[PDB]
Amino acid sequence: AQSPNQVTGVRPNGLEDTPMFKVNVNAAKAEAMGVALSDINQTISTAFGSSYVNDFLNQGRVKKVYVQAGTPFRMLPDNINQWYVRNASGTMAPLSAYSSTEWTYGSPRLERYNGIPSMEILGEAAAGKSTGDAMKFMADLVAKLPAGVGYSWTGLSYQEALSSNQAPALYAISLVVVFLALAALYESWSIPFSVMLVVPL
Amino acid sequence: ANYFIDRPVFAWVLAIIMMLAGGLAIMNLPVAQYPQIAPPTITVSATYPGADAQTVEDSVTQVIEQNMNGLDGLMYMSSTSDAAGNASITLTFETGTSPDIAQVQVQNKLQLAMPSLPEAVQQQGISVDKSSSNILMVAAFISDNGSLNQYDIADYVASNIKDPLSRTAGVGSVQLFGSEYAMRIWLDPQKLNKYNLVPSDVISQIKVQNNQISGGQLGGMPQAADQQLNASIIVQTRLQTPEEFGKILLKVQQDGSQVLLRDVARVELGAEDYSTVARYNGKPAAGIAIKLAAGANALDTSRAVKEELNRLSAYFPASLKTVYPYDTTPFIEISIQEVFKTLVEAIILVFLVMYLFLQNFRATIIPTIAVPVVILGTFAILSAVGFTINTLTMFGMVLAIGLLVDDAIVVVENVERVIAEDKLPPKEATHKSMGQIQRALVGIAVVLSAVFMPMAFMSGATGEIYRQFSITLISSMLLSVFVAMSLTPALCATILKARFNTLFEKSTQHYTDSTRSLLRCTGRYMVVYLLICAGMAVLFLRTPTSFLPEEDQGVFMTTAQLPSGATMVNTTKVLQQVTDYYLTKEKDNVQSVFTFGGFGFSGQGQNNGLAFISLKPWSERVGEENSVTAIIQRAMIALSSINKAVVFPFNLPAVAELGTASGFDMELLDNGNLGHEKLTQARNELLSLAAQSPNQVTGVRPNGLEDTPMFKVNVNAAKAEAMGVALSDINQTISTAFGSSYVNDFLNQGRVKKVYVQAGTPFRMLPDNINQWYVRNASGTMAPLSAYSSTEWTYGSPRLERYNGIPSMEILGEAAAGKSTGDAMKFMADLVAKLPAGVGYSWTGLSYQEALSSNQAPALYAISLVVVFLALAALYESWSIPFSVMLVVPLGVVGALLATDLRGLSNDVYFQVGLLTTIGLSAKNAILIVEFAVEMMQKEGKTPIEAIIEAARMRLRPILMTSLAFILGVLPLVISHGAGSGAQNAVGTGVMGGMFAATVLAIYFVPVFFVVVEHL
Amino acid sequence: ADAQTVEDSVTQVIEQNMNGLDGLMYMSSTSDAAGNASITLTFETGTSPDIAQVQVQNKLQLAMPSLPEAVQQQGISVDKSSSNILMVAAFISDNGSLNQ
Amino acid sequence: FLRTPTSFLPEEDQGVFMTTAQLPSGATMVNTTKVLQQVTDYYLTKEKDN
């Protein structure tokens, strides 16, 4: 970002870390009162997640059936206080009794490249500069990073690097081929040498 | 054609293009020890933890078999059900079938059949695998002193080594010899009884508490207006430590004390599969086999794999070393080096023959640069037609070298002779000589192509090897003809300029006067010829038949088998004795011993063991006392006193496809409806009827285990139901206690591992242990399992086999001293017919190949002979002239047969191809002589006798030069007795004994044949 | 499921088996907080898409037993089509009778 | 030749292009819809000629 004359609009192609909610269920207290941990987990998962139950028919097409809590009852961390779990004797006990809530942090999207963790980065080249110059500048910048991080070119950059690397060998092979063709066509080694001196012109 | 003589620059440009294309081909051409020889096979593997052989066969094997239909190119299918709970079905497909298509078809069929299988085998997952067995490296990892056991090494190599590999350029498949980690929970019947618990409760609590719960989202959609919060919810995560598993709450007592898993069981990070003990030189170890890819370079792949292992060695925990048993790179490198050395020595010998006969350095120059151009062009053609660089193709190149030498020698000698006489300038002499031998060269090319085609047009495993050899020879031949017709004339026109002599002149005069004395009573020699012909027949009836000579691969294999019902303690002791012997009595030769106890060749079991012995390099073992065959023949004597094992050493086959070229593989299908006992009765009637006649079959033996004692538990369902105990609970507690119980998966350091529940060791070792387990009533009271159950001892099969959906026995055997394989297969056939009514037989594996393609080579060679005769008739423009050429190649084959008999070798593939090359060269010489005679009859107005004598006189020198060059070019092959000496010795013997007899017989026998055929 | 749960179980289990392919150039993978694993294997030019898909689905069933339930129930999609949109066709309502 | 810049393929005017809007982490769709409506109303008003 502090070198706008070579690369512009460098941005990450990913999502940044976000706060996440954690619920800790006291299995010991739940078993002491009589409610089951499976019931608590299923209640939470169905209330705040979803539950694909069955298929039904609509206008002659098979569609899915989903069970979820209402919109007002899954918007806030305090809404967990509103849910109840049935005991083994039939009495209902609040879910807020045998539970504790807290906040942590976590990444909403994890990316991997060739089997190792990675972060995709996009960006354009500045006015006047080319894609190759931007690629070289990016490689130089990555070289100035903490030890242990590397860089890989992917997508269009892969093909660009391959073409730029493989062009001169193609030039040399084409020159050799045309030289040999001239030597074969005109039975002399003087004509090819007198002709191949014009290529630089 | 002849217009290249006027344009040397065109010929030089063509040579440069050929050399550049050859260099490009060598730069990127796959290399390997052998190509794909075996027909594609697909292996289906299923695991039933704790099941028996009969249970596996009834549940998994039969169900998978019944759905194995609709597969294209299927040849046969064989299934095995073990006593460890393993079902393995191998389906063999026809050669040429795409392995990926066959694999996907088998996988789809099994995928549709999956719901019919029990849940226990669905949980494990049935694996469908391609099979090529082109193992490149068997690199293993060892712990130095005692720190890391076999399971720690196996888990580390599974989680931090396999994934860095399997993605290296040229690596196709990585297979592991070991078991990863698992969460082993060892139950205690007394602790379970104290708390009134059963294994079902433990399994249920593990399933509910080692769970991943999808919490959902706070916020989410649909959401209310002005919502500003949206986060994920975490409820539960899968456990990841043994201590976490030990805190799993099972029940809460009325007192209030919490009952945990650790209160009733021992939780430990153990192994998934405990039934294998892998030791390297006596120390725990785990290994990996790398299987290479298609289109990859076996040299750079090996170098990159070694580099990656060296890089990862810095991350090893402690005292972890990487050894490399069975590396096949040295043999490929040796083959390439031998090919290059043979080429260089052949070039030097050609130079010596030229500056011994012709006495002109300019003459010696031309072949020296002609041969490498053709070799490089052959490499380019091999790359173009999609062929890899293996031992067979390189050996075909080795023979091709002499094939090229012959053409270069004849062309240059003819040009030099036409310069020597008639006082012609080099250009006009080149034009004349090329006019003389153009049609002869074209006819020679066509004849040799027709000769080499039958090897190309074969079928089976042998057909692929013959394809490699024939393609290499044909490409080299055609390119040599093109080069001798394009470049060599131009070089002769441009480069050439206008003691031994006395001896050669005297020899020519001797041949002339011998022919003058002969050609008057040819009839004598006529019948004499028949005598040699007769001898050839008997010779062809004496040489033994073998597929490929066994080579000094540097590794060999020893199998130890305990009698029956023997635990792994005795097998481990036996393997320890074996490795101690191999390491203290052969320390100079043997480098390492890799012993796998609990896994044999006849099936996995506790009474089996295998050992791979790796030897020192050939540079450290020299002579016959330090050879593989001698080493195993010394070890067999010492290991016969192993005290209650059937330990037996042997050498690895040259190719994993097959060995024992004399043995046979047959399966005795039961058919009908007779059971396992009535089939083993037939199998016992045989191996005895066959043993009563040892003049045809020697080693008739069964490839399978025999009946073993088994424990039977009879549960009184009525008594249990009367007492309130459910039969399901009784059947589940025993199964979970004695066999493993796979519960679910957990996360170890980010990798998914299994959780298993089983009883502790001291509680599942004796029949009395079943008296220690209790089951809960419906009222909550525990009662012993010994009340509703009784115990009994029966007999049962620890390994069942099926062939094509029918029970089989797979009685593999061997051939007699000399009886051929076909006679053995025709004896065991109708030996099965003497067996009781109901049974039948099938030939599988090797005997299958010699059951569908048998009368093929005679037809191919008859067609080849007809094509050769037609080509000769077209060349000579007559119907009787070709016979005088066709009746000479037996003289070529007779000497090769005699020499091979003298050396004591067998009818190897290398011998066959060398014999074909010698026949081709003899035919070429005869064709040239007869062409010169026919020309001197057409023009110059001469009788058939004087023409043939003068043609023989003219062509004596090139024949001698080519014979000397080829004979001395294969001389080092015979004298070689080191690494890669089998094929080398075979080709040396064949070529050296064929070429000399061919030339010696032909140079005298051509005129008499010519005059006899012309008279008739 | 969360992003970490998917990336640990599903993404990594499937990715651990995509090794022995024919002309694999490179493999990328994403795991989302909406419960989505998006492995993508880019092969060499000239490779047959049918053969590549066959190999990928052959190696996927070596990891399918290790995948958790509610992931096999929904289904594993193996697609050999292009990864870039060719054309988008939207549908609207003139007056506004039908909603989204 | 050593001073000329390298590239792969020149950029073209295909008649269509894209816009990506990314809100701070932890935001809801109530704000993303407003941001996307702002983008739409800018494109349809300040660039209605193209």
Residue numbers in the entry:
A (entry chain A): 705 to 905
B (entry chain C): 2 to 499, 513 to 1030
C (entry chain A): 52 to 151
D (entry chain A): 554 to 603
Quote what the paper states about this structure.
Bacteria can resist antibiotics and toxic substances within demanding ecological settings, such as low oxygen, extreme acid, and during nutrient starvation. MdtEF, a proton motive force-driven efflux pump from the resistance-nodulation-cell division (RND) superfamily, is upregulated in these conditions but its molecular mechanism is unknown. Whereas we discover distinct transmembrane state transitions within MdtF, which create a more engaged proton relay network, altered drug transport allostery and an acid-responsive increase in efflux efficiency. Physiologically, this provides means of xenobiotic and metabolite disposal within remodelled cell membranes that presage encounters with acid stresses, as endured in the gastrointestinal tract.
Here, we report cryo-electron microscopy structures of Escherichia coli multidrug transporter MdtF within native-lipid nanodiscs, including a single-point mutant with an altered multidrug phenotype and associated substrate-bound form. We reveal that drug binding domain and channel conformational plasticity likely governs promiscuous substrate specificity, analogous to its closely related, constitutively expressed counterpart, AcrB.
